[PDB]
Design a protein around this ligand. Structure first.
Ligand code: BCL
Ligand code: BCL
Ligand code: BCL
Ligand SMILES: C/C=C1/c2cc3[nH]c4c(c3C)C(=O)[C@H](C(=O)OC)c4c3nc(cc4[nH]c(cc(n2)[C@@H]1C)c(C(C)=O)c4C)[C@@H](C)[C@@H]3CCC(=O)OC/C=C(\C)CCC[C@H](C)CCC[C@H](C)CCCC(C)C
Ligand SMILES: C/C=C1/c2cc3[nH]c4c(c3C)C(=O)[C@H](C(=O)OC)c4c3nc(cc4[nH]c(cc(n2)[C@@H]1C)c(C(C)=O)c4C)[C@@H](C)[C@@H]3CCC(=O)OC/C=C(\C)CCC[C@H](C)CCC[C@H](C)CCCC(C)C
Ligand SMILES: CC(C)=CCC/C(C)=C/CC/C(C)=C/CC/C(C)=C/CC/C(C)=C/CC/C(C)=C/CC/C(C)=C/CC/C(C)=C/COP(=O)(O)OP(=O)(O)O
Ligand SMILES: CC(C)=CCC/C(C)=C/CC/C(C)=C/CC/C(C)=C/CC/C(C)=C/CC/C(C)=C/CC/C(C)=C/CC1=C(C)C(=O)c2ccccc2C1=O
Ligand code: HEC
Ligand code: HEC
Ligand code: HEC
Ligand SMILES: CC(C)=CCC/C(C)=C/C=C\C(C)=C\C=C\C(C)=C\C=C/C=C(C)/C=C/C=C(\C)CC/C=C(\C)CCCC(C)C
Ligand SMILES: CCCCCCCC/C=C\CCCCCCCCOC(=O)[C@H](O)CO
Ligand SMILES: [Fe+2]
Lengths: 323, 273, 243, 332
């Protein structure tokens, strides 16, 4: 058994790493702290952390939005400190309930939401630059920055793009623990059971696959951890016995395999496609499809089942039946 | 037929049962005893699905469905057309999954590596049992289990979730979803990082393990490490079905109301009410 | 009139549905599946373009690996049909076959952020420590699978880049020793280091290295491979049926 | 935090749809023993005599009964509405023709309403029907009523906490949540849907593609409507003590035929019935009830689902007195 794959039995300490970046070496902040219990399942050193203009813009815009949201939450309980801590999950900031179209809604009905939405967007955009710039500041590929973009893009879809495309701010996602959860069903109901949106199935297929892949890959690297498999950069440019057996375990199992490099393209793609498929689903939704179930019925894809309890005629269509 | 570095490894041994008898390869596939039993269960299972699909007004994949019995049959045997086909296929599916798992144990054994992959594979097998056996057994009938059809089994999940009003409030479900999300996130980060170091652009120098840790020290103020991301990863991915199983088995056997109401334990406490 | 409606019974979302499948299979088959075949190919007994990595401190390496000279097998086939298993003609631990096999990758000690040797002893490692709370293997006995003292701790070897110990190395009783053991193969107790991968008589062959202060990559693989070969070959009792 | 096994499960859809009820025996058992307090019908009486339109001076609804039959009704009503204070709750001690107290004039209206339900709304109550008890359960104030805003507790026989009181605005979200099965849906389905016939419960389109003229900008209903519909559904479900699959195949909530249960259609006739009761019988009563009965906007107590069901698919589990008191309806 590998006791190293469970926890690191013997832990190592030494002088701080510091690799210079093209800029901002001085804007690193924090004296690095060592946690013994953290270092049983990760590296013990916590910090330092890089500030830099994009990073601080993120916290500025971000906090601004959160403040808006928390303040609007506090008012929902008359600013009672007890009830706020109590009802917190039920509290939220809601998009306009009346139909103002794309017109900027009143502060008490959607206004504060739109503004909190705006500052949140600025916050995400600020952090993106951080993710991007830090990559090429350290002479690294922007693979992370572009994955993070797909997630940012999708949030924009459910946040403002799809609202703009259908022409209503009322279709936005509220801020809150339960309230933003409530939106999920209101949106699915409105558009005819989202189980019948193909890009929904696609997005799910990719998300599940993200589970499968890093369950398999995560376990794969643990299995060849005795051969220093976790050292992957120097297993790509230079193949050793770790991914020899890793490539062969899967080749003997499913009939084909990847490389130590290419398996990372598989996981990056799957993750990307969770967002890519989702965004396409939301865009199509409302715009060009108004009921995904009926859309499937039209194309003869929807399943049909025999009656258990008798067929029930729509009473609204009965002769003499009320409005 | 073989990889450039492969024949080095194709030695005998590492069998659990069978010895030399099934210790051989078919193309790139290893067989072993559990290769033989897998094919048996898979042939039988697919045949049953085929013969069952023979019978309905079937044939286009999206409309093909093989359903469990009525609730009234309890845990008893059902008429093959009225649920029995499902019962058998269920069994075959379990034979196939477990075989596939132990086959992986045999392959790990011959390669001299840890058994982490087939041990990981026990988690989805486990969840399948929760859905198709466990929760039915507690509820008393097999008819509570999901049907085998590409679209039909979605409608099973759909109705089941609504049977508890808003399935979103299911705390077991909240944990499960949380793990599915963060796992997809971590996979994107990790794969993206490794590529960033090996594929950094233009006429480049491939960067180092110090650049790895470097990057996440700057962005979030911590890097978990090269080896630790892989145990973290197996941890997040596994806890999808490890935590989610609680919310599934709790629905029915241990809770019959809507899941939003379940949070009455927090909301209805006398000194907040 | 309807949004998204086209000619016949056709609509926009219907078209995108096909485009989605086309893109996905294009990426999977005409990219990801080809990216998978960068090493191990071509087969013996569809491929992609070359690629050239520029390595951190001098030199390049490019997909495939067109290699020095190739090792000579020390195994005999068990039967003549294509998929038959093979069988060790000597001691499978010494000719590095099966789970005892290693990779033929450059005998270079590969390095740190700044040039130094990455995997080095604490007698070298300057400034590296054992974290307060974890046990010090310094001077402990190494107990093999047969229960016999195979020897005693000498030093522990650290990755200078990741701050992570990867090898114990130790003395054998009775051969003027010393050689490597990956700590994936060790169970660190308070008074002993338990190793069940090999018997104590078999520590005698643990691949030595031209250096006492170094360790190169082929080495790292040569050392790790042999202990892993013990999981199947240490006794006649491991090539078994478990049942 | 949890309810011990086993659990009572029913099947309402095709096998393998996971459609049906999920009930906890202890809850169900408790509800029967509560609904079993339905007083037994009074023994039958003399069929002959002059109609009380001859006999009594101020009888305008039940004027065709004989005196023995008419008094029987008065005993039953007394049982059902005001058993503790008896007749004098609704009668001047020695002038029984007098409408000098308010429960008299309301009780007349209440007689007509009850007959209305059993006669005109047989698409809902069928031959089960209702009596005074179905809502009152032995008290002048029905336990489950609803004002023009969320109130707590749902049962007015229970003492409200401070935060539950309608005046305490810090607790508005909870009042809203508990009427909607503890969801955070920010909508009151009673006033939106059940108090009147103004708004439409249906919000899901009946075409695949968006219909031009109703799918862009201010042509569209706000998404808020689907929320509120969800809120009505949460409320109805808790009121009957079931879930969605009791009525829907959640494959497509918007569809009837095999995609719905006969109960959903019955339920449809209930909403229509409840609106009728509120708009034409109960709401106009604020002019006859004392100020102490009225809500904060001068509203009289009005009925929803729960008013009769009180947590059950059928009120009092199908118990009826319909043939025991034909004067209560249906009416020829
Ligand atoms: C409680 C949760 C639900 C559930 C909820 C959902 C939802 C919701 C969705 C799916 C989707 C899918 N589900 Mg399901 N699913 C459950 C359990 C299962 C089981 C099982 C053994 O228990 C199977 C085989 C499947 C199979 C599948 C696929 C048809 C599809 C894509 C999944 C995917 O990419 O995964 C990750 C795996 C990979 C990326 C690798 C490739 C796997 C391929 C796709 C497997 C195809 C198997 C196919 C059914 C044939 C079976 C065998 C025949 C004998 C040939 N589900 C349970 C019952 N599943 C989506 C869909 O599109 O459905 C139509 C979807 O929207
Ligand atoms: C009744 C309710 C509906 C439902 C409603 C919806 C709706 C509506 C949608 C989905 C969507 C998704 N659903 Mg669905 N869903 C249901 C049933 C399921 C089932 C199932 C087995 O039953 C599964 C597996 C899923 C799973 C999925 C996902 C695969 C998919 C993408 C969303 C996602 O991952 O977001 C997780 C990822 C993110 C949110 C990205 C976040 C990225 C950003 C950068 C994070 C920012 C953090 C930062 C700190 C925030 C600071 C804030 C401060 C204020 C500043 N759903 C049913 C049918 N679901 C989407 C989709 O694909 O639609 C086509 C979608 O829009
Ligand atoms: C209205 C309906 C409800 C809903 C109803 C349910 C129900 C009901 C359940 C879930 C469950 C799950 N839900 Mg859901 N869920 C909803 C909304 C969501 C949302 C969202 C964005 O709102 C998300 C992210 C999710 C996500 C999730 C998953 C994380 C979770 C576990 C899935 C599972 O069991 O897979 C199961 C997958 C397997 C068992 C795969 C097994 C594979 C086996 C081992 C091998 C197969 C081999 C194959 C056949 C081989 C083919 C050969 C080919 C060659 C490849 N749900 C809505 C609100 N959801 C479950 C849970 O845990 O709940 C707490 C659950 O029980
Ligand atoms: C399929 C692919 C997916 C994926 C991918 C990726 N995700 C990434 C990256 C990639 C590739 C990054 O590179 C980036 C990162 O850094 O990685 C280390 C990142 C991130 N993913 C976050 C959260 C997240 N991802 C989710 C979803 C998925 N992601 C899906 C699954 C979800 C869900 C499911 O809800 C969540 C919550 C943040 C941690 C971070 C952005 C922070 C931000 O933009 O902050 C901007 C906001 C702030 C700076 C606010 C700071 C607030 C403090 C408390 C201020 C004080 C306030 C005061 C108390 C007020 C009163
Ligand atoms: C939490 C951890 C998770 C995780 C992890 C891992 N996953 C693994 C491993 C690990 C670690 C492996 O090592 C192993 C493997 O080698 O990978 C390449 C495996 C694999 N994961 C597969 C599918 C998969 N994983 C899912 C879920 C998770 N995986 C989650 C995320 C899902 C979902 C979500 O639906 C799917 C579809 C196969 C591709 C493969 C097994 C092949 C098999 O077992 O062959 C043996 C069986 C057959 C070839 C067919 C048997 C057919 C029966 C008899 C007849 C049909 C019956 C069937 C019930 C009908 C269903 C109808 C349908 C519409 C309802
Ligand atoms: C050479 C070699 C061995 C290659 C092997 C490569 C290999 C096996 C790769 C596997 C990895 C792959 C390809 C993964 C892709 C699968 C993924 C991620 C997702 C699939 C999920 C999936 C089936 C989604 C379907 C979406 C849904 C639910 C659709 C229902 C609605 C529907 C079909 C409507 C009808 C559509 C239309 C317009 C017309 C049909 O008539
Ligand atoms: C002909 C016959 C009957 C022979 C009998 C012998 C026998 C047992 C045959 C088996 C027959 C059967 C059932 C074959 C089916 C095999 C299956 C299930 C194939 C499905 C393939 C699928 C869809 C896999 C999903 C996961 C996925 C997208 C993988 C793509 C990327 C890959 C290959 C990941 C695997 C992989 C991972 C995860 C690494 O970490 C790693 C690290 C270092 C080097 C290589 C690798 C590597 O290859
Ligand atoms: C909850 C209301 C209520 C209760 C309880 C009640 N009454 Fe009645 N009573 C009425 C109403 C209203 C009328 C007139 C109904 C009508 O016009 O058809 C009426 C009519 C009568 C009349 C007709 C007198 C006349 O000249 O019009 C008599 C007598 C009478 N009730 C006696 C009784 C008796 C006896 C009891 C109990 C044992 C009783 N009441 C309890 C409300 C009530
Ligand atoms: C006992 C009855 C009943 C229950 C319980 C019930 N439904 Fe409803 N539902 C109906 C009826 C009747 C309508 C249509 C009302 C109308 O036509 O005015 C409807 C309408 C709907 C609609 C909108 C249909 C459309 O055309 O827009 C949705 C969505 C819905 N229900 C979902 C649910 C949800 C969600 C639940 C529970 C959480 C639920 N059903 C439980 C009877 C019920
Ligand atoms: C004033 C009386 C009253 C009100 C208000 C009321 N119900 Fe009913 N309902 C009844 C009675 C009495 C029955 C018994 C019918 C039967 O036994 O078939 C019934 C039957 C039903 C059934 C049939 C259950 C079954 O198992 O067959 C459903 C569903 C239902 N009601 C839903 C509702 C809905 C929806 C509402 C309001 C929106 C409502 N109830 C409010 C009196 C009422
Ligand atoms: C104290 C610490 C460590 C953290 C604090 C976090 C905290 C307690 C926050 C408080 C309450 C909580 C938990 C809030 C959570 C809210 C959630 C879950 C929100 C989820 C999704 C919200 C979404 C997707 C909103 C999207 C909205 C948008 C993208 C709007 C876009 C707006 C624009 C583009 C503006 C352009 C239009 C212009 C003309 C005005
Ligand atoms: C992806 C999310 C990862 C979250 C990990 C954050 C851990 C907190 C680390 C904070 C580092 C701040 C510097 C520490 C020294 C304090 C001065
Ligand atoms: Fe990796």
């Amino acid at each position: 058994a590998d006791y190293q794959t469970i926890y690191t039995q013997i832990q190592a300490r030494g002088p701080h790493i510091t690799v210079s970046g093209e800029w901002g070496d001085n804007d690193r902040v924090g004296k690095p702290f060592y946690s013994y219990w953290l270092g049983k399942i990760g590296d013990a050193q916590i910090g330092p952390i890089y500030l830099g203009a994009s990073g601080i813009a993120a916290f500025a815009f971000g906090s601004t939005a959160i403040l808006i949201i928390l303040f609007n939450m506090a008012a929902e309980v008359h600013f009672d400190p007890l009830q706020f801590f109590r009802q917190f999950f039920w509290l939220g900031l809601y998009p306009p309930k009346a139909q103002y179209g794309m017109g900027i809604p009143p502060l008490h009905d959607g206004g504060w939401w739109l503004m909190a939405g705006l500052f949140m967007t600025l916050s995400l955009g600020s952090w993106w630059i951080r993710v991007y710039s830090r990559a090429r500041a350290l002479g690294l590929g922007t693979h992370i920055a572009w994955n993070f973009a797909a997630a940012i893009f999708f949030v924009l879809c459910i946040g403002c793009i799809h609202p703009t495309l259908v022409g209503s701010w009322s279709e936005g996602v509220p801020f809150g623990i339960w309230p933003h959860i409530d939106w999920l069903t209101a949106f699915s109901i409105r558009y005819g059971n989202f189980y019948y949106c193909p890009w929904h199935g696609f997005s799910i297929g990719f998300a599940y696959g993200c589970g499968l892949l890093f369950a398999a890959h995560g376990a794969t690297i643990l299995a060849v951890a005795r051969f220093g498999g976790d050292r992957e950069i120097e297993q790509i440019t230079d193949r050793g016995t770790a991914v020899e057996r890793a490539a062969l375990f899967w080749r003997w199992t499913i009939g084909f395999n990847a490389t130590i490099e290419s398996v990372h393209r598989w996981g990056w793609f799957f993750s990307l496609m969770v967002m890519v498929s989702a965004s396409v689903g939301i865009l199509l939704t409302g715009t060009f499809v108004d009921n995904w179930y009926l859309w499937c019925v039209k194309h003869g894809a929807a399943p049909d089942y025999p009656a258990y309890l008798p067929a029930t005629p729509d009473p609204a269509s009965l002769p003499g039946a009320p409005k | 037929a073989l990889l450039s570095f492969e024949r080095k490894y194709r030695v005998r041994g590492g069998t659990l049962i069978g010895g030399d008898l099934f210790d051989f390869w078919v193309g790139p596939y290893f067989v072993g005893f559990f290769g033989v039993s897998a094919i048996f269960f898979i042939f039988l299972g697919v045949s049953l699905i085929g013969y069952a699909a023979s019978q309905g007004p079937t044939w286009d994949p999206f409309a093909i469905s093989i359903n469990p019995p009525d609730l009234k049959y309890g845990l008893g045997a059902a008429p093959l057309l009225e649920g029995g086909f499902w019962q058998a296929i269920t069994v075959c599916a379990l034979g196939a999954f477990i075989s596939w798992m132990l086959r992986e144990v045999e392959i790990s054994r011959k390669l001299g590596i840890g058994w982490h992959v087939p041990l990981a594979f026990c988690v989805p097998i486990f969840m399948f049992c929760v859905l198709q056996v466990f929760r039915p057994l507690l509820l008393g009938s097999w008819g509570h289990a999901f049907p085998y059809g590409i679209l039909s089994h979605l409608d099973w999940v759909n109705n089941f979730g609504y049977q508890y009003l808003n399935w979103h409030y299911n705390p077991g479900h909240m944990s499960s979803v949380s793990f599915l999300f963060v796992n997809a996130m971590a996979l994107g980060l990790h794969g993206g990082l490794i590529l960033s170091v090996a594929n950094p652009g233009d006429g480049d120098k491939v960067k180092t393990a110090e650049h790895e840790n470097q990057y996440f020290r700057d962005v979030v103020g911590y890097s978990i490490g090269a080896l630790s991301i892989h145990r973290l990863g197996l941890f997040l991915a596994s806890n999808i079905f490890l935590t989610g199983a609680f919310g599934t088995i709790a629905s029915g056997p241990f809770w019959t109301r809507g899941w939003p109401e379940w949070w009455g334990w927090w909301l209805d406490i006398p000194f907040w009410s | 009139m309807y949004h998204g409606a086209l000619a016949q019974h056709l609509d926009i979302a219907q078209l995108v549905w096909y485009a989605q499948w086309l893109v996905i299979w294009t990426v999977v088959l005409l990219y990801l599946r080809r990216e998978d075949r960068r090493e191990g190919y071509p087969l013996v007994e569809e491929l992609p373009y070359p690629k050239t990595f520029v390595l951190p401190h001098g030199g390049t390496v490019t997909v495939p690996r067109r290699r020095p000279e190739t090792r000579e097998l020390k195994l005999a086939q068990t039967d003549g049909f294509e998929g038959a298993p093979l069988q060790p003609t000597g001691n499978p631990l010494v000719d590095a076959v099966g789970p005892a096999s290693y990779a033929e990758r450059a005998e270079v000690v590969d390095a740190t952020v700044d040039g130094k040797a990455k995997i080095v002893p604490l007698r070298v490692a300057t400034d590296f420590s054992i974290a307060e709370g974890d046990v010090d293997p310094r001077g402990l006995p190494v107990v093999a699978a047969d229960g016999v003292e195979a020897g005693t701790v000498t030093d522990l070897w650290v990755d200078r880049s990741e701050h992570y110990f990867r090898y114990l190395e130790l003395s054998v009783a009775g051969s003027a020793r010393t050689a490597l053991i990956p700590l994936g193969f060790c169970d660190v107790k308070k008074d002993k280091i338990v190793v069940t991968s090999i018997l104590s008589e078999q520590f005698a062959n643990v691949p030595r290295l031209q250096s006492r202060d170094q360790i190169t990559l082929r080495e790292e693989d040569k050392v790790s491979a042999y202990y892993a070969g013990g999981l199947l070959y240490a006794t006649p009792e491991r090539a078994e049926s478990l049942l | 935090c949890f309810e011990p096994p086993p659990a009572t499960t029913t099947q309402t859809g095709f096998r393998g749809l996971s459609m049906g009820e999920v009930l906890h025996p202890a809850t169900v058992k408790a509800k029967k023993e509560r609904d079993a307090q339905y007083p037994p019908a009074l023994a039958a009486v003399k069929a002959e005599g002059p109609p009380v339109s001859q006999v009594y001076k101020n009888v305008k609804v039940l004027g065709n009964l004989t005196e023995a039959e008419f008094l029987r009704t008065m005993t039953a009503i007394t049982e059902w509405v005001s058993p503790q204070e008896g007749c004098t709750y609704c009668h001047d001690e020695n002038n029984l023709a007098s409408e000098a107290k308010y429960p008299y004039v309301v009780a007349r209206r209440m007689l007509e309403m009850t007959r209305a339900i059993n006669t005109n709304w047989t698409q809902h109550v069928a031959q089960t029907g209702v009596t005074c008890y179905t809502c009152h359960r032995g008290t002048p104030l029905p336990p489950y009523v609803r004002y023009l805003e969320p109130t707590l507790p749902l049962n007015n026989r229970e003492t409200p906490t401070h935060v539950e009181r309608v005046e305490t605005r810090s607790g508005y979200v909870v009042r809203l949540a508990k009427y909607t099965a503890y969801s955070a849906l920010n909508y009151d389905p009673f006033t939106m849907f059940l108090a009147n016939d103004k708004r439409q419960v249906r919000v899901v389109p009946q075409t695949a593609l968006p219909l031009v003229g109703v799918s862009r900008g201010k042509e569209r209903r706000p998404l808020s409507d689907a929320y509120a519909t969800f809120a009505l559904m949460m409320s109805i479900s808790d009121s009957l003590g079931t879930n969605c699959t009791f009525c829907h195949n959640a494959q497509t909530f918007e569809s009837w035929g095999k995609k719905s249960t006969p109960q959903r259609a019955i339920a449809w006739w209930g909403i229509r019935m409840v609106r009728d009761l509120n708009m034409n019988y109960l709401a106009p009563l604020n002019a006859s009830l004392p100020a102490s009965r009225l809500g904060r906007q001068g509203e009289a107590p009005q009925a929803d689902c729960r008013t009769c069901h009180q947590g059950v698919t059928k009120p009092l589990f199908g118990a009826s007195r319909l043939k025991d008191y034909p004067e209560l309806g249906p009416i020829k």
